[PDB]
Amino acid sequence: MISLIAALAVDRVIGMENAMPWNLPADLAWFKRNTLDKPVIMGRHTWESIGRPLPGRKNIILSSQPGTDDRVTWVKSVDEAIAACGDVPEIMVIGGGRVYEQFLPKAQKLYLTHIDAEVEGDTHFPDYEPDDWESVFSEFHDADAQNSHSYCFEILERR
Numbered sequence: 001m002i003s004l005i006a007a008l009a010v011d012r013v014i015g016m017e018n019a020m021p022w023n024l025p026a027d028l029a030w031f032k033r034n035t036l037d038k039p040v041i042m043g044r045h046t047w048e049s050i051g052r053p054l055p056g057r058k059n060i061i062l063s064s065q066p067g068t069d070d071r072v073t074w075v076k077s078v079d080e081a082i083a084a085c086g087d088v089p090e091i092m093v094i095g096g097g098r099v100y101e102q103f104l105p106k107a108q109k110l111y112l113t114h115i116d117a118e119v120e121g122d123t124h125f126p127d128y129e130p131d132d133w134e135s136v137f138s139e140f141h142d143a144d145a146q147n148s149h150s151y152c153f154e155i156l157e158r159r
């Protein structure tokens with residue numbers, strides 16, 4: 001099964017010209033909880049953003065240009081990325097925009113963090129029909145001493 005995991009500000013904003021203007025360690029901990037020991041597929045901009053390989057996960061980078069880091073796997077097609085995951089119960093697609101776009105139609109599950117931030121987006125999560133999805137988990141949190149905005153965790157399963 002393929003799943004997508006994303007953090008969405010208002011209007012589905014997922015990325016900006018520069019680093020996103022929030023500080024959400026609790027969301028990064030949710031991200032880790034749901035990706036640890038699973039293969040993760042990402043595009044090159046997201047790979048650059050993260051800075052290094054995500055620990056304890058097989059990192060696959062989907063890209064048309066040859067790779068510039070030997071500590072991860074570089075693939076040139078969606079089907080190559082999937083094959084590189086081998087035989088695992090769940091593949092996690094971690095962005096960014098174009099990669100979500102490409103994997104959405106194949107995905108059966110979404111792990112979304114909705115962040116209460118009004119920002120002008122450079123890239124957006126795909127316009128999914130919430131109509132077509134079943135929320136099986138939701139959990140709301142206010143901003144606190146460590147987290148700058150209010151956010152809500154959701155898991156959704158393809159109806």
Ligand SMILES: Nc1nc(=O)c2nc(CNc3ccc(C(=O)N[C@@H](CCC(=O)O)C(=O)O)cc3)cnc2[nH]1
Pocket residue numbers: 005006007027028029030031032046049050054055094095112113
């Ligand atoms: N829920 C969610 N939040 C994210 O911000 C997110 N970000 C991207 C890509 N960006 C990033 C940026 C950093 C890390 C990261 O540093 N994760 C660490 C935990 C952070 C820490 O320990 O300081 C990890 O080990 O997973 C992951 C994804 C894709 N899906 C997401 N999904």
Ligand SMILES: [Ca+2]
Pocket residue numbers: 134135136137
């Ligand atoms: Ca429900």
Ligand SMILES: [Cl-]
Pocket residue numbers: 026029030031033
């Ligand atoms: Cl968590």
Ligand SMILES: [Cl-]
Pocket residue numbers: 042043044045046047095096097098099
């Ligand atoms: Cl990307």
Ligand SMILES: [Cl-]
Pocket residue numbers: 133134135
């Ligand atoms: Cl629902």
